[PDB]
Amino acid sequence: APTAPSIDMYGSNNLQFSKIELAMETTSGYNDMVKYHELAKIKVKFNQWSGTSGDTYNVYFDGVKVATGAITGSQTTASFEYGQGGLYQMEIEACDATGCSKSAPVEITIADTDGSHLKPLTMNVDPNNKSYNTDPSIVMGTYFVEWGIYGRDYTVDNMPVDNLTHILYGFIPICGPNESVKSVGGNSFNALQTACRGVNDYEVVIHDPWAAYQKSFPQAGHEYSTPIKGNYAMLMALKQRNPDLKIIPSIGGWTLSDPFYDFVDKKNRDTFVASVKKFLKTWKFYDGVDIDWEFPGGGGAAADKGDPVNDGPAYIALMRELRVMLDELEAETGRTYELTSAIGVGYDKIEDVDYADAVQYMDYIFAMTYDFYGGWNNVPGHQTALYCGSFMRPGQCDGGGVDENGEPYKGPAYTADNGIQLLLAQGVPANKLVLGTAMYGRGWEGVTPDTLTDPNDPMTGTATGKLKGSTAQGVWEDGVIDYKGIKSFMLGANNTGINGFEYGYDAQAEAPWVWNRSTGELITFDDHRSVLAKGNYAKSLGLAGLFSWEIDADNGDILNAMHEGMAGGVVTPPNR
Numbered sequence: 001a002p003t004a005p006s007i008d009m010y011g012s013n014n015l016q017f018s019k020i021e022l023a024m025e026t027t028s029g030y031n032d033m034v035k036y037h038e039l040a041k042i043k044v045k046f047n048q049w050s051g052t053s054g055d056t057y058n059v060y061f062d063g064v065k066v067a068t069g070a071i072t073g074s075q076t077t078a079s080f081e082y083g084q085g086g087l088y089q090m091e092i093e094a095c096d097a098t099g100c101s102k103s104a105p106v107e108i109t110i111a112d113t114d115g116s117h118l119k120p121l122t123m124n125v126d127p128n129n130k131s132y133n134t135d136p137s138i139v140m141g142t143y144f145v146e147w148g149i150y151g152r153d154y155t156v157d158n159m160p161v162d163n164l165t166h167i168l169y170g171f172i173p174i175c176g177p178n179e180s181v182k183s184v185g186g187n188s189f190n191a192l193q194t195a196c197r198g199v200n201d202y203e204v205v206i207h208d209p210w211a212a213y214q215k216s217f218p219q220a221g222h223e224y225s226t227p228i229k230g231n232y233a234m235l236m237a238l239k240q241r242n243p244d245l246k247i248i249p250s251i252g253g254w255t256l257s258d259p260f261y262d263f264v265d266k267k268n269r270d271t272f273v274a275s276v277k278k279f280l281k282t283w284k285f286y287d288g289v290d291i292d293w294e295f296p297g298g299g300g301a302a303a304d305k306g307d308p309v310n311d312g313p314a315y316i317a318l319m320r321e322l323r324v325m326l327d328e329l330e331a332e333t334g335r336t337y338e339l340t341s342a343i344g345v346g347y348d349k350i351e352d353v354d355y356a357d358a359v360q361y362m363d364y365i366f367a368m369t370y371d372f373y374g375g376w377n378n379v380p381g382h383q384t385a386l387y388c389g390s391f392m393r394p395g396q397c398d399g400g401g402v403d404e405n406g407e408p409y410k411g412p413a414y415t416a417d418n419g420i421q422l423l424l425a426q427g428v429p430a431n432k433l434v435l436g437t438a439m440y441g442r443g444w445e446g447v448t449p450d451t452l453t454d455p456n457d458p459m460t461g462t463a464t465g466k467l468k469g470s471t472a473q474g475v476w477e478d479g480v481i482d483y484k485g486i487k488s489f490m491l492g493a494n495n496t497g498i499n500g501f502e503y504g505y506d507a508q509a510e511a512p513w514v515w516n517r518s519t520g521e522l523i524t525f526d527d528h529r530s531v532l533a534k535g536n537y538a539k540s541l542g543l544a545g546l547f548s549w550e551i552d553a554d555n556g557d558i559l560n561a562m563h564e565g566m567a568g569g570v571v572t573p574p575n576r
């Protein structure tokens with residue numbers, strides 16, 4: 001007396017209460033599927049069927065009073081709000097003037113999107129990824145792709161997190177013009193139309209809610225009724241394991257950049273910046289935002305887009321206004337938020353943005369020092385080289401030369417160093433630049449020995465088309481192959497070549513190749529040596545560190561070599 005509350009355990013997903021409502025077993029518009037609440041609504045039914053009811057109840061979490069209210073009669077509903085996610089030991093107590101009696105304790109879960117209710121994620125990482133003691137100042141970045149969980153079968157728990165400082169999550173789309181998404185075929189454009197139903201143009205949405213939060217991952221302990229699932233629940237648990245990990249959503253990319261070209265109208269930036277603030281309030285494991293606008297001024301997937309007059313000032317303004325917004329979130333939350341961007345480094349991309357201006361709002365620029373050459377045409381070259389290759393013509397490297405038809409080069413050749421120097425020369429600080437590493441090759445076929453102008457160098461040949469292969473080989477798209485695929489099908493464990501491929505390296509460029517003389521297949525990629533050279537280069541220049549696209553395509557070798565090449569190095573972190 002009063003009789004002790006007895007808690008009705010049924011009808012509340014095992015006393016799991018979530019700050020976020022996520023539609024399950026359906027795909028619909030983003031605003032229909034996801035609803036976040038600053039306070040979780042907690043409802044607990046208890047009864048008291050024998051004896052005295054009492055007047056008032058108290059709820060305790062781990063022995064601390066968190067709520068109070070009136071006992072109704074022999075069955076009451078405890079009803080209150082709670083902000084802090086976590087697992088708690090709950091007891092419900094009933095009181096009158098004679099005394100108090102409490103229920104047995106029971107575990108309650110309040111789910112939040114920081115993973116505060118989650119144990120540290122159990123990892124399953126390829127043991128070929130080694131341990132290193134790289135100084136924590138240095139960036140060690142990679143992209144994890146949302147769609148990597150299907151045929152690529154590579155999931156949040158496979159990531160070598162201890163070897164990473166930054167995980168960039170590709171990709172968050174923007175609602176609006178998105179015809180470039182059609183390039184990918186399959187259901188990707190249609191999925192985005194669905195996600196955007198009922199969403200204002202220029203607002204961010206989750207492209208694939210199945211992958212992001214609906215799919216149950218048994219390696220993460222997910223059950224079908226778990227309130228948050230998918231990659232997102234796993235990234236939440238991953239940050240419980242490595243609290244210093246920075247996880248940042250990457251907006252745009254190659255096929256998702258079309259809406260960016262309408263940011264010349266401030267009204268659209270305003271709509272975008274506001275939706276990003278809300279996305280970050282909703283999805284708390286995220287530590288800022290990365291803008292991958294490919295590209296201010298054009299030259300991206302959309303041939304009918306790009307304005308070299310207006311896009312640069314739009315990008316700068318975008319950065320300015322995103323930084324004002326993240327400073328708000330910082331004031332509101334007490335956390336630190338980073339603002340980053342992946343950018344083209346061809347001279348004709350750099351010249352369209354005044355980065356001396358932009359960079360003051362930014363923590364890091366991810367210099368996309370890859371995709372210099374590839375299967376879109378029949379011209380071999382080093383796709384991710386530091387320096388000018390031996391294949392290049394006299395004056396090709398600095399742009400003063402003329403091509404084979406006597407026509408002038410329009411600018412310096414596509415190499416990582418030409419791009420970095422252009423950036424530094426404008427006043428972009430070295431400690432804000434992160435150098436890109438490829439975890440993939442680009443490739444051709446038809447490059448047989450008779451096409452070569454220098455018989456020692458297949459970069460002087462001519463292709464007949466793109467490299468072809470199967471997904472099991474890591475060829476997910478013609479002319480592109482996962483690094484792990486090159487290792488399995490071209491290098492072999494000793495790196496001396498298998499399946500009729502030979503290995504070669506251009507010492508001047510700092511760039512490897514593998515070439516099968518008989519099929520004419522030629523692949524340009526990053527290997528251990530070229531990545532060690534990129535780390536050396538980053539050390540010499542005082543760059544922020546290295547990042548890579550994309551970790552699912554690595555087998556440990558690239559990330560390991562990223563680490564090895566920065567051994568001993570330290571950098572000054574930036575300020576925004």
